[PDB]
Design a protein around this ligand. Structure first.
Ligand code: CDL
Ligand code: CDL
Ligand code: 3PE
Ligand code: 3PE
Ligand code: 3PE
Ligand code: 3PE
Ligand code: LMT
Ligand code: LMT
Ligand code: LMT
Ligand code: LMT
Ligand code: LMT
Ligand code: DGT
Ligand code: MG
Lengths: 51, 172, 120, 320, 98, 142, 105, 55, 345
């Protein structure tokens, strides 16, 4: 029975699997050096990290 | 010293109020650690020993995992504390005021019912076997190995099945 | 209601005191109907598997009929026993409490003045 | 014992059967590109099972007595009608394409069932992975509606991800002017009516979509006609492929068990091709639908389940 | 004993109120469940001590054992929620309204 | 509690007398039903702001209190005028007046008409239950 | 229990630590052991409905022993009456109630 | 009467009421936060009824 | 899942209720309910999509919260009486929160809102376990303390469940949601009679289960999740049309089907106790269930909805289902009213 509240409801997917918008890649970006014992004092190693 | 256990159970109440307000789980985790410590003291205060130390040890381990999970999966740019939001702060203060009020009023109406501020400390320990030897709480817990083995069978099964459960939940 | 009664064995399908009751006839109408349901179950099973309804699997049909009758006989014995116990308790309780169940002396219609309600 | 968890537990396991040539190979290309002769020789030289391209009657020939059925029982679609009038308002174009996708899906499940249960490889001629190049060509030529495209992409979304893709995809590249010449030499009256624009759409879909998509997870081998004409050269390339990419690398005994459970159950395979989306092109009213269904169950060998049809010589029914 | 058990029951009630009144983080709610467990552990332990019921002291330990299993499953579920949506917010868990 | 007693006072005196007290009791009862309904409405169908939630709580509670006032007043005046304390018809008239009020507040003749019949019948049956000793929640006996 | 499997098999998985009077480690009787033993024994064999009325004496005693409402109130009354008299200067606690007892033994 | 008012007052008003009640109770947001709030109301109501009916 | 996992998890799903039904100690009953919650979660989320993750999460937080309230009641009773079972002397508020929390575990209205959502988010065979096997342990606890329960709360829960099960099922096009509302309505009947005659609670539970099990198997045969999907039965498996129609009419309680018996006997027993008004309201609103079942019967067996061209390929394929358990339950759930005296006493 249509209602104003539920006018925007769509039927669920046929196999129960929803197509969701792509999730956000969220890697940590870290400055490894230049002032770092392992960076030889002058290397700015920009790292993308996951954990 | 006659107010000692009431003070502890009063501190425990505040800890659960802080947890109920649900700030960032970082401070929620801290709130349970303090409540666990206060809860250990209450068990000790009633003559416990093993049970109080167990629950603190278990909750120390439990909140360390929750800290790790919080930094990965339950964090925001600006984690909330109890003071950050005026609304949460107000209900923290109001909740503490309502505790003082609730204990004050209940003391007036009954005086010996749920609250008996006149008799605090007189009704903590009821009976104690003065000349006994084998009385500590660890002896009671150890009955799982001899007289209450069914309790240990079900406990052991749930931990064993838990390994298979969490492996299934977490596989992609 | 009857579970806590005296002399109640736990999880006993057919207590030994049930052996004083007459057993059901093997052609009891309730047991004949049970076997008919088993026959219907066999035919419905054939239909659902797209098999000839009456012809396919007479061995499977016979097992369906025999299982329903076999189970129904023993279940009917248990149900007979439970109803017999209910009457045994009810009447026994009536005898222990004759003050709660007096014999009511009824009056003849020569003495009873029922009101007449004319139809008109 | 029908295959299941018990049979799997009692030793019946896929990884014991896989060997060097337990592969799924598909041969693609435009119309008249020589896929069939190549696919037959790849399978023959490698000891693999050749599956001819799934057609309209594929389901008819793999069930019952394997004989073709009347067309109303078999998708009620016609390739010849498609070439005569690709814009017929009876929905023949998309009804054909939808039927051919489902017949390909059935064949892909049959081929996967064969590989998983025996360890012998298979060689296919196009597949569900490459069926869309024909759908795109129809839509680009205005032969089908957009809603037909959306219907097709929904069914594909619901069915294709459940399967493992082929190990190696072999593509024969023949340009459209050469394809047209081969169709005219082929001498089929209706296929000769295919426009070159339609053939170009197929090639465009193949080279912009299918090949880049497939290279992410399969070994792709592209040949021109002159290379493909010597099938022993193609086989030699197959013998030295490495197969170091794709989903087949992370399969184990129990993921193979559950895929096998899917692909032996054909009504489960075909489930989402029949979702109740009421596209007019592929919707049958109950009067036609029930007349057709009643006649199908009056065909020989079709009234009852196989093994229960006394009129085709089935015996011992009363003990089955 | 009288006043301690009143305060412990209030502590459980607050933790339950925390459970029933969601904010955003699912993890904050999982912490409230651990709060109810903690309150019930102390209540059971203090009761056993006050009555000198040594045969009941296994029971508080079994409360913690199953609470650990409940908490482990809760965290395992929270990993799944975070993988889908990139947060543990409960407002995302609304696909089953239709 | 005394709150329960305040509601038993409705039946302490026969209908058609003390119509002021009976109107307060039914107005209070209607308000409580409005507060309960409002709580479920705002909790399960939240408003766009807090001032709309509070506005909706007031709309439901006053409308429910108005229905309870009209029912209680009309029932007592009807019994007073007709001099019939024990007539379920007095309660049907009151329940219809309550049903008409609900329709007037929501701007609907269909709710007024449908409200009048359903609420009248429910109220009339309540009076019959009070007279004939029906129990809404009997305790187990057999 | 809903299914009396334990009774049918004659085993005890959880029947034997059901109340205070049950067996305790090293025979350390729980508080109110004698009152709970009396209440359980009065009730045995007559059913819950009858036990509620006819074992009312035993239950009240056990309830008082365990929860001690009356004991707490009685001591509150004595200590409250003592507070009133001491303020009025009509009662002086003896030496042994003031911490200057002659300890025994 | 037969085509209008006997229809409107008996079968058609019954149909309207239960359709209206159906849409007001089944239009749920699927938010666990809202359901748990409504369960809190249920708990409070049950505690209030117990208190007033306490002899 | 590999076989070792299946065996352990299914064994724990079976074990929990057996522990609950066999336990004297209330703590071991709670332990049994804990096993059920923990073991069923991995099955709920096995397929691993956002909807199954939502369903498993909503199920977990509801069930774990209800489990804590049950434990609170057990602990409060242990404090009051020094025992691990509820007695005649147990404080009435302790018993009322037990009833509240168990009814939330069962999905009785107004604690019902989770159940249609969780059933919608999981596979049909898991919905079957959720609505049948998982009801037994919480009900078994309630049956043990039936003389202690408050008739007022029960009837209010019961009438609420019947009302919302009815109106809830009226708006559904999803089969899994229709079954969930059918569950709630039937639980309302089971609960109404529990404080009067717990044997009739069990009679309703058994008849509900043997109706619901073959109904789920019929949905499972083609994986029919919607009304429009089940409306294709006439073309896919027409042999099932007779038994689905009779099972639906039996679920609705139409005589002379077996499903009329639970409603009939519960009304009889409610009126032996003067519970006339509730019994009338219950029976009248249970007709609304028969309406949405009839509309379902209209779209499956009494009319023929439009079919599609790909369904012809399905008619070429042989099926190996249903198992013969379907036929047995289907027949005994519809055609056993003549044997009514053997089912009530
Ligand atoms: C140690 C003494 C405090 C010294 C802190 C300090 O260096 O001065 C900062 C502060 C001076 O002002 P500020 O440096 O500008 O504040 C910025 C801080 O970063 C802002 O401070 P913050 O980011 O650390 O957040 C403060 C927040 C965080 O602080 C805490 O809550 C942790 C300690 C709680 C114990 O505290 C509160 O919200 C109020 C706490 C109320 C007590 C908690 C009661 C409820 C919980 C019950 C369980 C008990 C645990 O004082
Ligand atoms: C006495 C209480 C003692 C303290 C005990 C506390 C117990 C634990 C607290 C757990 C609360 C919680 O976590 O909920 C989070 C819940 C969700 O928080 P959120 O998702 O972060 O954002 C919504 C908030 O409004 C935050 O977002 P917002 O800033 O947009 O909120 C707007 C609005 C929110 O309006 C409110 O202030 C809500 C509180 C109304 C006053 C209630 C008085 C206590 C009764 O604030 C205002 O402008 C009104 C301020 C003036 C209020 C006086 O927040 C609330 O709705 C209020 C929480 C505090 C209320 C605690 C009172 C509990 C008593 C039961 C109330 C329900 C009874 C219903 C049946 C009758
Ligand atoms: C041993 C055989 C176990 C499999 C079985 O027969 O039970 C059926 C079901 C799996 O069914 P399915 O995969 O479709 O094929 C079954 C083929 N026997 O079996 C299952 O799905 C898993 C059954 C788990 C419950 C059994 C646990 C045994 C504990 C000892
Ligand atoms: C006593 C008075 C009880 C009143 C019953 C609640 C009715 C409140 C209501 O109006 O429905 C609330 C909710 C949505 O209502 P809403 O959308 O705000 O209003 C229509 C907007 N056009 O509609 C709903 O979702 C249903 C409301 C929740 C269920 C109410 C439970 C009633 C109490 C049963 C307690 C049983 C105790 C045992
Ligand atoms: C079972 C028995 C069935 C058979 C008995 C039939 C006897 C009925 C005879 C009298 C019926 C007279 C009705 C006249 C027609 C009125 C009509 O059709 O409109 C009904 C109207 C529709 O509502 P609407 O205008 O759309 O506004 C939105 C409301 N949410 O209004 C509504 O639908 C909503 C009205 C709600 C108020 C009515 C009371 C409901 C609560 C019951 C209280 C009982 C205690
Ligand atoms: C045991 O759980 O039975 C529960 C219930 C009987 O209730 P209760 O007495 O309280 O249980 C204690 C001892 N049974 O037992 C019941 O409620 C009975 C459940 C019956 C389910 C009916 C389904 C139809 C099956 C019909 C075939 C069964 C045999 C019919 C009679 C055969 C005799 C010919
Ligand atoms: C379906 C899964 C379940 C099967 C798996 C579990 C198998 C059972 C293993 C646990 C066995 C417990 O076995 C049980 O032990 C207890 C002590 O603990 C014994 O208990 C015995 O000693 C105690 C000591 O206090 C006495 O108080 C008690 O009266 C007496 O019966 C039981 O007589 C025995 O039946
Ligand atoms: C707008 C029409 C509504 C139709 C619905 C039915 C309306 C009739 C109900 C209202 C009648 C007057 O209100 C009714 O009487 C008083 C109020 O003081 C209370 O009356 C009753 O109270 C309690 C029930 O808790 C009984 O034990 C008591 O014997 C009886 O007096 C009822 O709680 C209330 O229901
Ligand atoms: C003893 C008999 C006593 C009779 C009085 C009690 C009966 C009460 C009937 C209430 C009727 C509903 O009240 C009536 O609702 C209509 C709905 O169209 C509204 O009517 C007004 O607004 C609506 C829209 O809001 C416009 O379409 C309409 O043209 C205008 O008149 C008014 O709010 C009121 O005129
Ligand atoms: C369309 C909706 C209405 C559906 C109608 C339902 C059927 C008709 C209802 C008839 C009403 C019953 O009427 C009522 O019956 C009950 C039960 O016997 C009796 O009422 C009395 O029953 C017993 C004594 O036997 C008392 O303990 C009880 O307190 C009292 O209610 C009276 O006879 C009458 O008060
Ligand atoms: C108390 C009296 C009991 C009455 C018993 C009720 C009997 C069952 C009624 C439901 C009827 C089942 O529904 C009926 O199913 C049969 C197949 O079995 C269908 O049968 C028809 O269509 C199917 C395909 O759909 C064909 O294969 C079949 O040969 C043809 O006869 C009917 O079109 C359908 O209407
Ligand atoms: N509309 C449509 N036609 C198709 C589809 N698959 C094949 N066909 C048609 C195109 C051709 O006219 C006809 C013959 O198939 P082929 O493409 O394979 O041509 P042919 O077999 O002659 O050459 P080959 O050696 O196999 O490469 O089948 C399809 O998915 N959709
Ligand atoms: Mg070809």
């Amino acid at each position: 029975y249509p209602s104003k509240e539920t006018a925007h409801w769509k039927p669920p997917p046929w196999n129960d699997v929803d197509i969701l918008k792509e999730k956000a890649v969220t890697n940590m970006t870290l400055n490894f050096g230049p002032q770092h014992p392992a960076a030889h004092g002058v290397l700015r190693l920009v790292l993308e990290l996951s954990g | 010293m006659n107010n000692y256990i009431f003070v502890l159970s009063s501190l425990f109440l505040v800890g659960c109020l802080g947890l109920a307000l649900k700030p960032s789980p970082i401070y929620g985790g801290l709130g349970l650690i303090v409540s666990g410590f206060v809860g250990c003291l209450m068990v000790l205060g009633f003559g416990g020993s093993f049970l109080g130390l167990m629950v603190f040890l278990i909750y120390l381990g439990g909140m360390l995992v929750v800290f790790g999970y919080t930094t990965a999966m339950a964090t925001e740019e600006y984690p909330e504390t109890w003071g950050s939001n005026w609304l949460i702060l107000g209900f923290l203060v109001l909740g503490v005021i309502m505790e003082v009020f609730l204990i004050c009023v209940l003391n007036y109406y009954d005086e010996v019912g749920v609250i008996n501020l006149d008799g605090l400390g007189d009704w903590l320990m009821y009976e104690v076997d003065d000349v006994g030897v084998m009385l500590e709480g660890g002896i009671g817990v150890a009955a799982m190995y001899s007289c209450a083995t069914w309790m240990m069978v079900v406990a052991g099964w749930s931990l064993f099945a838990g390994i298979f459960i969490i492996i299934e939940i977490t596989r992609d | 209601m009857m579970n806590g009664r005296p002399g109640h064995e736990p999880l006993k399908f057919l207590p030994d005191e049930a052996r004083s009751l007459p057993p059901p006839k093997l052609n009891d109408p309730r047991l004949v109907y049970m076997g008919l349901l088993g026959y219907c179950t066999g035919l419905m099973d054939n239909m659902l598997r797209m098999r000839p309804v009456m012809r396919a699997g007479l061995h499977r049909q016979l097992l369906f009929v025999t299982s329903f009758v076999f189970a129904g006989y023993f279940y009917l014995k248990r149900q007979n026993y439970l109803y017999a116990v209910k009457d045994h308790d009810m009447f026994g309780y009536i005898k222990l409490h004759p003050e709660d169940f007096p014999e009511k002396e009824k009056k003849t219609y020569a003495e009873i003045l029922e009101p007449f309600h004319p139809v008109r | 014992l029908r295959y299941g968890l018990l049979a799997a537990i009692l030793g019946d396991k896929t990884t014991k059967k896989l060997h060097e040539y337990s592969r799924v190979i598909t041969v693609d290309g435009n119309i008249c590109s020589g896929k069939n002769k190549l696919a037959k020789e790849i399978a023959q030289q490698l000891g693999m099972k050749h599956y001819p391209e799934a057609g309209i009657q594929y389901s008819s020939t793999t069930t019952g007595d394997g004989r073709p059925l009347d067309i109303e029982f078999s998708g009620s679609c016609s390739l010849e009608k498609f070439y005569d009038d690709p814009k017929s308002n009876d929905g023949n174009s998309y009804r054909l394409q939808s039927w051919l996708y489902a017949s390909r899906l059935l064949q892909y499940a049959d081929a996967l069932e064969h590989l998983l249960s025996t360890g012998q490889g298979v060689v296919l001629e196009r597949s569900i992975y490459s069926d869309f190049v024909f759908l795109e060509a129809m839509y680009n030529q205005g032969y089908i509606r957009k809603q037909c495209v959306d219907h097709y992409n929904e069914i594909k979304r619901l069915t294709l991800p459940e399967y493992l893709p082929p190990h190696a995809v072999i593509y024969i590249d023949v340009p459209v002017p050469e394809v047209q010449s081969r169709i005219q030499k082929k001498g089929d009256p209706h296929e000769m009516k295919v426009t070159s624009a339609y053939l170009q759409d197929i090639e465009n879909a193949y080279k912009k979509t299918f090949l880049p998509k497939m290279s992410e997870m399969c070994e792709v081998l592209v040949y021109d006609s002159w290379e493909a004409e010597d099938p022993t050269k193609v086989v030699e390339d197959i013998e030295y492929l490495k197969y170091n990419k794709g989903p087949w690398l992370k399969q184990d005994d129990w993921t193979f068990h559950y895929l096998r459970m899917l692909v032996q159950d054909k009504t489960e395979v075909l489930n989402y091709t029949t979702i109740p989306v009421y596209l007019p092109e592929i919707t049958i009213g109950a009067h036609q639908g029930s007349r057709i269904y009643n006649s199908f169950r009056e065909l020989p060998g079709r009234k009852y389940a196989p093994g229960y049809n006394a009129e085709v010589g089935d015996k011992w029914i009363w003990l089955k | 004993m009288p006043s301690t058990f009143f305060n412990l029951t209030m502590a459980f009630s607050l933790s339950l109120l925390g459970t029933l009144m969601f904010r955003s983080h699912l993890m904050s709610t999982l912490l409230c469940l651990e709060g109810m467990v903690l309150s019930l552990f102390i209540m059971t332990s203090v009761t056993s001590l006050n009555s000198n019921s040594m045969s009941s002291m296994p029971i508080p330990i079994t409360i913690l054992v199953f609470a650990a299993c409940e908490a482990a499953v809760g965290l395992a579920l929270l990993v799944k929620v975070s993988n889908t949506y990139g947060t543990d917010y409960v407002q995302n868990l609304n696909l089953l309204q239709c | 509690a005394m709150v329960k007693r305040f509601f038993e006072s409705y039946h302490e005196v026969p209908d058609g007398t003390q119509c002021h007290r009976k109107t307060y009791i039914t107005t209070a009862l209607g308000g409580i039903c409005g507060i309960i309904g409002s709580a479920y409405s705002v909790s399960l169908n939240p408003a766009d702001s807090t001032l709309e939630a509070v506005a909706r709580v007031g709309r439901y509670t006053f409308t429910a209190a108005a229905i309870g006032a009209m029912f209680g007043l009309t029932t007592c005046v009807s019994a007073q005028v007709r001099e019939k304390p024990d007539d379920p018809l007095n309660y049907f008239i009151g329940g219809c007046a309550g049903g008409l009020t609900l329709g007037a507040r929501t701007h609907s003749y269909g709710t007024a008409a449908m409200g009048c019949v359903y609420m009248g019948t429910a109220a009339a049956l309540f009076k019959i239950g009070k007279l004939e000793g029906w129990e809404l929640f009997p305790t187990p006996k057999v | 229990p809903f299914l009396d499997i334990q009774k049918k098999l004659g085993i005890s998985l959880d029947r034997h630590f059901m109340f205070l009077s049950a067996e305790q480690p090293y025979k350390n009787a729980a508080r109110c052991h004698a009152f709970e033993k009396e209440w359980i024994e009065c009730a045995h064999g007559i059913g819950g409905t009858r036990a509620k009325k006819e074992c009312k004496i035993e239950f009240d005693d056990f309830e008082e022993c365990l929860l001690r409402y009356k004991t707490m109130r009685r001591m509150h009354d004595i200590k409250k009456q003592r507070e009133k008299l001491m303020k009025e200067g009509k009662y002086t606690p003896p030496p042994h109630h003031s911490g200057r007892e002659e300890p025994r033994p | 009467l037969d085509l209008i008012w006997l229809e409107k007052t008996i079968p058609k008003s019954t149909s309207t009421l239960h359709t209206n009640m159906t849409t007001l109770t089944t239009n749920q947001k699927g938010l666990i936060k809202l359901y748990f709030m409504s369960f809190l109301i249920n708990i409070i109501l049950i505690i209030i009824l117990y208190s007033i009916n306490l002899e | 899942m590999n076989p070792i996992t299946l065996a352990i998890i299914y064994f724990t799903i079976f074990l929990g209720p057996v522990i609950t039904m066999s336990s004297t100690n209330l703590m071991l009953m709670w332990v049994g309910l804990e096993f059920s919650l923990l073991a069923i979660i991995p099955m709920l989320i096995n397929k691993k999509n956002p909807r199954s993750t939502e369903a498993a999460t909503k199920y977990f937080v509801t069930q774990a919260t209800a489990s804590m309230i049950i434990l609170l009641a057990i602990v409060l009773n242990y404090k009051q009486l020094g025992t691990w079972m509820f007695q005649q002397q147990t404080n009435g508020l302790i018993l009322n929160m037990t009833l509240m929390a168990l009814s939330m575990k069962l999905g009785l209205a107004p604690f019902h809102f989770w159940l249609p959502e969780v059933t919608q988010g999981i596979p049909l065979h898991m919905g079957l376990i959720l609505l049948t096997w998982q009801k037994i342990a919480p009900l078994s606890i309630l049956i043990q303390i039936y003389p202690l329960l408050n008739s007022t709360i029960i009837l209010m829960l019961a009438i609420t469940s019947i009302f919302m099960g009815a109106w809830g099922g009226l708006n559904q096009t999803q089969m899994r949601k229709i079954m969930a509302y059918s569950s709630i309505a039937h639980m309302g009947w089971m609960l109404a009679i529990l404080p009067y005659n717990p044997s009739l609670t069990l009679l309703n539970l058994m008849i509900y289960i043997i109706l619901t099990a073959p109904m789920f198997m019929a949905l499972m045969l083609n994986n029919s999740m919607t009304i429009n999907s089940i409306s294709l039965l006439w073309n896919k498996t027409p042999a099932m049309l007779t038994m689905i129609s009779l099972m639906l009419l039996s679920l609705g309680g139409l005589p002379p089907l077996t499903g009329f018996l639970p409603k009939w006997i519960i009304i009889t027993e409610l009126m032996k106790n003067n519970c006339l008004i509730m019994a009338t309201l219950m029976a009248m609103m249970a007709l609304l269930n028969l309406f949405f079942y009839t509309r379902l019967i209209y779209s499956t067996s009494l009319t023929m909805f439009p079919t599609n061209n790909n369904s012809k390929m399905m008619t070429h394929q042989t099926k190996t289902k249903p198992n013969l358990m379907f036929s047995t339950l289907a027949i005994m759930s519809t055609m056993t009213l003549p044997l009514a005296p053997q089912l009530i006493t």
